[PDB]
Subunit: 337 residues, 5 copies
Amino acid sequence: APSEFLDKLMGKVSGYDARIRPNFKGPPVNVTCNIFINSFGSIAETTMDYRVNIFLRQQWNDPRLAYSEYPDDSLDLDPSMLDSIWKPDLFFANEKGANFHEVTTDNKLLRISKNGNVLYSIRITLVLACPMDLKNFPMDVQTCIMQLESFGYTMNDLIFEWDEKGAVQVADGLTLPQFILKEEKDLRYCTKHYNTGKFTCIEARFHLERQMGYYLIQMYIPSLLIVILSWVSFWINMDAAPARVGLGITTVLTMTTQSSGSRASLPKVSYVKAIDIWMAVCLLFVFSALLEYAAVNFIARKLFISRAKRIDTVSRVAFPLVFLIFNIFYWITYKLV
Amino acid sequence: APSEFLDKLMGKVSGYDARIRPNFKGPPVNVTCNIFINSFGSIAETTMDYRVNIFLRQQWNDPRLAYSEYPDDSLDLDPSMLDSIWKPDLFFANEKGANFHEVTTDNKLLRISKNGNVLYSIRITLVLACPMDLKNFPMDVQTCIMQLESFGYTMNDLIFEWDEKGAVQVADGLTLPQFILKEEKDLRYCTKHYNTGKFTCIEARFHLERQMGYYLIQMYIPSLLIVILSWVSFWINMDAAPARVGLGITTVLTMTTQSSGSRASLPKVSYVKAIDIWMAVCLLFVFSALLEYAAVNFIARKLFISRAKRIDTVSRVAFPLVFLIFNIFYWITYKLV
Amino acid sequence: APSEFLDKLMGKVSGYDARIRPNFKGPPVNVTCNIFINSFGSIAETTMDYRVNIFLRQQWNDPRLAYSEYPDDSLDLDPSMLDSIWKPDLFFANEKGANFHEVTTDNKLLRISKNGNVLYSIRITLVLACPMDLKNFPMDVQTCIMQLESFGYTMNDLIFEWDEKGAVQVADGLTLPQFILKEEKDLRYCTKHYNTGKFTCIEARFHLERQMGYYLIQMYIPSLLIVILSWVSFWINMDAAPARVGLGITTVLTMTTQSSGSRASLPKVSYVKAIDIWMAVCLLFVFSALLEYAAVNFIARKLFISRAKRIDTVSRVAFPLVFLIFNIFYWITYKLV
Amino acid sequence: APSEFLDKLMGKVSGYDARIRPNFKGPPVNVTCNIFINSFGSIAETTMDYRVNIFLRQQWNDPRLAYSEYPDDSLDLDPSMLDSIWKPDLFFANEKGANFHEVTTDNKLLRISKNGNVLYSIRITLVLACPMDLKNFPMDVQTCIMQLESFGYTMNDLIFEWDEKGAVQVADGLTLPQFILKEEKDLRYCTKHYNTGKFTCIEARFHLERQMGYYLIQMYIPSLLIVILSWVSFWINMDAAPARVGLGITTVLTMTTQSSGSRASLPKVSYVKAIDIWMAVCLLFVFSALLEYAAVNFIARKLFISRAKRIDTVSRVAFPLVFLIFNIFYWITYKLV
Amino acid sequence: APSEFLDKLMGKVSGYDARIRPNFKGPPVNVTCNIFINSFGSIAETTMDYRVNIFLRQQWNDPRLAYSEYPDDSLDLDPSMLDSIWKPDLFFANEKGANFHEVTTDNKLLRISKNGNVLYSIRITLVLACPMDLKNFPMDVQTCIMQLESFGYTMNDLIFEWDEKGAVQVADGLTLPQFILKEEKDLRYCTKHYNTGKFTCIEARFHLERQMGYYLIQMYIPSLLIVILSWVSFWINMDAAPARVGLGITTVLTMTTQSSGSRASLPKVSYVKAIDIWMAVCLLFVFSALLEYAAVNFIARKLFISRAKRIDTVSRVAFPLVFLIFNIFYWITYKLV
Ligand SMILES: O=C1C[C@@H]2OCC=C3CN4CC[C@]56c7ccccc7N1[C@H]5[C@H]2[C@H]3C[C@H]46
Ligand SMILES: O=C1C[C@@H]2OCC=C3CN4CC[C@]56c7ccccc7N1[C@H]5[C@H]2[C@H]3C[C@H]46
Ligand SMILES: O=C1C[C@@H]2OCC=C3CN4CC[C@]56c7ccccc7N1[C@H]5[C@H]2[C@H]3C[C@H]46
Ligand SMILES: O=C1C[C@@H]2OCC=C3CN4CC[C@]56c7ccccc7N1[C@H]5[C@H]2[C@H]3C[C@H]46
Ligand SMILES: O=C1C[C@@H]2OCC=C3CN4CC[C@]56c7ccccc7N1[C@H]5[C@H]2[C@H]3C[C@H]46
């Protein structure tokens, strides 16, 4: 019974057009649409994108196609009969690629309300492209934009607008592997201005903060500690080279293999990033040990001895102070601010 | 003969609706469904998901469409004629993507029993998304949820419920590469509460225990052993630096390259994980050797000698005791408890 | 001419059923099927599977559909008209996923013989899942099962059986990258017993022997050689530490970086595997050098000297003998036996 | 109303041919086409290609099919009715593979203007193959060609030509991970000459400059610094070997592990590339230290001492001067020029 | 006009069979086919295959379907009407998988000449499987076979044969990343002999020479140089161990980390390959240094001194001579010959 009464409305009986939008040659069609996101994942420095599947929930009413006569409330049509009725034409502007889910039954759901309101929900997996600045890598804060624009309909034809309450809803417990998702989700309108006209889009923004913990423990601390070891090598006797020169050289080598391993494990990028800066500077002080101490060892070979001891006290004071001033600038620079 | 008698029931002859569920404007439809899983694989820290193909076995009876007249028992229809009859609309809630198998013949099998019972079995490969906490990596225990929910039908429309005997059945000898599958499989109901209503889902839970063996042998033991070597470096003569300072520096370098290699082979994660904690702490004691011994070497340059020997005995007692207390806390912390 | 005479047989003219098998309500249908495999590849520890494309050759005769009237011998129908005639419903039980080849023309070939014999050959690429035990990795022998089962037809309905001569035929010169394929191919029947009944399957088994050569040369020999170097470090003077202690420490460090590199290049597995055992044990003796020699160095600081020399001779005898007994157990354990 | 009036024009009513182009047996059809590119990504040394999705905007007018009678301006037909009208047949010549986006609604948009002008815009993701010469890797400048050619229509049949204003338009803020996109985009005609005839193509060229920063900091500076350390090892006493020979040997080892790590992180290529040249040469000087110093150490064992000191001064002058001349040649060679 | 006149020929009007080949019950059909290859890429040791897209150009004439009446020369039919006419059934024998390009318009082009000649060109991307012997890796020469065979038609039914002039044509400037393509392309017939009969195939062969440059510079030279360093360690004083034993031990360690890094970067193979042989042998001499020098150091502890000096001169002469004889055998062995 509801099938045939549906066939009268959406079929060649009477009349209707899948081609023609509601209110043709009239006021512009509103689509109030809200999304419920199932998952984030695979956020890669490489392809410069993340992958997400959402439940896209669109609502719009056409004056046409509303019975008000028939006993049942709302209505439901089969995913195959989905073509018969006009749907708002929507793409995401920034995805590389997307797909429906056909698993088991088809995931396209549609309901036509008594009053003529239409609820159209589809489940879509899609890969969106987000621009990423790793300029500060460990202290990094990434912003993720998901923007939904109409395709081939100007402001005059239709408008996209968010739901008042719970427009974009994150399914809880996503626990993304490399990032934490900031609870605050900032959504706002966007407008496309082209030669052909003005087109709607709605832009959603998710703030993803990179958690630096693993990098703090695996990368920073060992290197810093090695630097302390070189500082202790500055304390070494004003006579013996091979254990002292040794301390410095060992310091250099350990620093180098550390930087090598970290350079293997980090994301591949050709622009200078924060962690790389830090590794490099640490390596620089590690060298500076053997620089000042080779200066001491060469000047050693009365006045020269006093200059060597003054260079020794000067080293002892300067290394921790310089590295402290440097830390003070660095951390405050990249973290917040 | 069974084809045409099938065409009477499922065809436009008499009447039937693929659109309309059984018992429309009536009592809610039960689907008793049980799954037989063929394989687990590719459980990745990266995409935060695993891949599995199952035989999904659904059973429900419609009062309509039951002959009882025809000589043959049950019936079978071709996978192409599958559309004619109503099927319960089901997705998995947590998969990123899924597909049917069309290989050789189509894998959708359907039988319509004499009494009007319907057995619908399909073979589906699908990638399900499981949240993973590697917070304790080596001692890790992962939980895997597979949840089957109806799409577009409220509690009033239909109910999903497990089989009484052997609801979820693991095909034996899966032997997952990185994990062991706990024989206990815990399944239970779940209920979706949304603005539109209450929807059914059935939730299956597989416990996967990570086996820590390879990490115990390749990562822990060498590092620990190196620590013992530094302990032996504490025994070294109270005079000679370069072999002793040498022992310490070598200890540091070996520790660092070990941590580097392990940092390459482990799964990539930006939050601090157990194995990383352990590596780091070991590296810390490795340093502490050269710290205490540089304290000794500097204080060495009557009372100072006694303080050096007391620092030597204190080192000999403290290092094994501190590392023992630490192990005692650590292992009990992450393993079970 | 053969097209229309084909249309009489397989068409609505006269009668036939794609739905209904041959000999319905009668004796069970034999399908004699043999496969010719084109390629093996991508055998991964990771996904626990290999990829193979085969020519699947099925033969069965239906009493129906046999002309015997028409002049031409056999017959051929277009891949699109393939649906008209009944085909035996077959899946592979263990694949994750599979596909036809549509490249250029369609690869489904079918011939209907004069006597009523049917030859149906299709080209299929598919990814089969094989359980792998790397418990012994270098000396490893893998077994690969390809099993073909009927889908939705009990023993009463049909039977699968191999060809008498050349049932499974390997296309020569496959030269798999990491494995060698044992010429002996062992195929045998298998029977599925389920609540619904008994179903046929034919199981093919390929023995793949892993060739250990690259691991013998790149991993074992250097490590073993390093162990010999430590043995030579046992010969070192009973006086001087830094070159001797040095020899030992260097031995340890080289061993560690070797184990690290090998730990990067090997397949990722969380259960203890043979090569890992071996690496670890070697590292253990490498340590044992510095253990016994630190015992000597500490006991050195009349009777103590004699105990040191006795520990020296004891070391010289024990290390090669212990490592020899160990090799004797190990190699015989994992290789064959 | 516009649907049926569209059906008169593009339908069997009156006449039209999807098969037959405009102006058949007449003047050649112009297609003015401009592209707006959404994203670049995944530019891999490996597959020798990049991935891009564009909005392809084609414009051509057919004398046929232009109403001029009907009140509405332009027109729009559904993506399914797209086949009815003739479209210019276009491939990209260099892609490995490509696809449409079907997500939500179909992304093919078409408008038929009153005058008979046709605007056809489609959204296409496609993977284009660009030849890459890494002969100079760090200082590298890559050129990316996107070429659009007609398929099966000679110069006599149709012509492709760019838009006058804003033919190829980059969507701002692409921020490709490993490269920077030069704002200058050079597009020009190309002509295919084959045995069958002459075919049109339009060729677009994007200049991508590789930014060498990360390689300057992570690879060059540490190595160079190590070289300086060996220079300082030339200053070492004319007597003592083990700290000096030590300095050299340590220099060699650090250099080697640096080259190893960099050899892991760089793109895999079997032809000699710039960064590799540089690493190798640095390693060569690092050796040259121990070469000249072993010459000194051997000649040391009156005149021989003077030759050793002269070799010492000669080393001190030559190493920085040779390495400076080398840098002067190298950097100017690969960067610009 | 040409559309309908095409419909007479290829349509049910008059008669024609897509099923039935030209000259049925007659002389065998020739297809002269030549390919123009667009790209090579992704040649992987792993999957044992390469990926290529070609323009496949087939030509054959059917006596049927030739008008000779109609004014226009040749003809063109739409890719959708491609089914109406018979096409030669062709697969590539060795591909794992393949696909058409549907991007923008369909890439299948067909022309039916006045005389009844048929030109059928299609653009196909496909992944072909080539057997690879890395037995000699750096000096490697790979051969790539592309073989095109008819599917389901015996020698009696049809024949495949190359074009006389320019049968296989490489699009210039392919510049494959790891290989160079030898300009000489050797194509020849191949014949399939099976139980069912004899089938045609045409086999094309591309010679790909691996360029060893990057391996010569990054792998060989550093190792060899290290060996020279050990040779220089043979010159070291007949008294002092720790710098000399040191030189040897350092030599060993650097060699080991070099072999480790190279073992990470090379393609993964379980059979012994040339570069591995070389690395191993070099490591062997590196050891042999400490072997002979430990022999000297132990025999040192009148006649014994003379034996030590004779072992010293013997070492100095033997190492370069043995390594030279070895190089002489090795390089000539793997390169050419
Ligand atoms: O003519 C154009 C080209 C232009 O390309 C950049 C991206 C676009 C996305 N939407 C949908 C198609 C478009 C549009 C709508 C109606 C007529 C012509 C037309 N377009 C594209 C246009 C923009 C904006 C708009
Ligand atoms: O209006 C909605 C949106 C909402 O999105 C979050 C996830 C959902 C999954 N199932 C199937 C679709 C839905 C539903 C059923 C019937 C009418 C409307 C409707 N939906 C979604 C809804 C939930 C729950 C339910
Ligand atoms: O009811 C079932 C479920 C069960 O699932 C595990 C795997 C199976 C594979 N084949 C094809 C489908 C099945 C079968 C045939 C006819 C009626 C019911 C039915 N099945 C599955 C069954 C097994 C065995 C058999
Ligand atoms: O006969 C051919 C083969 C040749 O192959 C190399 C690449 C080609 C791409 N376009 C489209 C097909 C082609 C063409 C057009 C009309 C008749 C025959 C024909 N072709 C190919 C040709 C070229 C150029 C042109
Ligand atoms: O009966 C067979 C099996 C056999 O399998 C190995 C590979 C083959 C490829 N081509 C196309 C199909 C085949 C063929 C043609 C006509 C009748 C039967 C038939 N086949 C396969 C055959 C070979 C050779 C040939």
